[PDB]
Design a protein around this ligand. Sequence first.
Ligand SMILES: *O=[P@]([O])([C]C1=[C][C]=C(C([N])=[N])[C]=[C]1)OC1=[C][C]=[C][C]=[C]1
Length: 241
Amino acid sequence: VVGGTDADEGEWPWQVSLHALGQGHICGASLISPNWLVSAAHCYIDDRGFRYSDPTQWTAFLGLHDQSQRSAPGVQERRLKRIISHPFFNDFTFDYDIALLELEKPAEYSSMVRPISLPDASHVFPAGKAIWVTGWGHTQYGGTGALILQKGEIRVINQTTCENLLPQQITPRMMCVGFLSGGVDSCQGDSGGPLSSVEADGRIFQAGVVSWGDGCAQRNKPGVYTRLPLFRDWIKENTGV
Ligand SMILES: *O=[P@]([O])([C]C1=[C][C]=C(C([N])=[N])[C]=[C]1)OC1=[C][C]=[C][C]=[C]1
């Protein structure tokens, strides 16, 4: 997250850190039940040097605040039993960029570990709405990741505007969120983590999933996120959640 600030400890207890064997933190995820996480499909695509699609080559850290303190009170470490990537995911366009991660053993909810509510299929997060992104990604483009979980408040962008800012790249599965003036944005390493919509009365919903962007925090280049309401039935079908 570029242009954000340190989260309070336990402030985003649904935020998860996913480490690939021998590489440290690669992507985020969100806790949605004791056994399941939501993340981005593109994080789990093999490359020539490493099988990111192999669930056994991941470790999930639940209840984490500081990447240098992974044995701190509150942290629950888990392996993945499986990675369900969306059937329509396209690694060229990043359409349908969403995956479901099954933990090998369930999380136990605590002050540091708690699920985020899913939005139902009819839920709308209208253009203009201020919502939050969190993660341990780069805090500057080309920079390095954050040790301490970062948070940044960003706004949903109109879809026609989004399409035009990133021409021939936006599908209905995607949403731009950020500022047209840049400054605050997700960045490398935030992928797969949640957009958290915090309402005045304490209702909190996951609005989307960090997916991709053109640079980070540039003007007229807001981050692109996977919309979550459209996937409510797919999540129910595949996980029971
Ligand atoms: O999801 P990622 O962190 C890539 C990414 C880049 C930029 C934005 C943005 N809003 N400007 C969002 C997402 O995935 C990666 C890629 C390489 C290494 C680790 C994670």
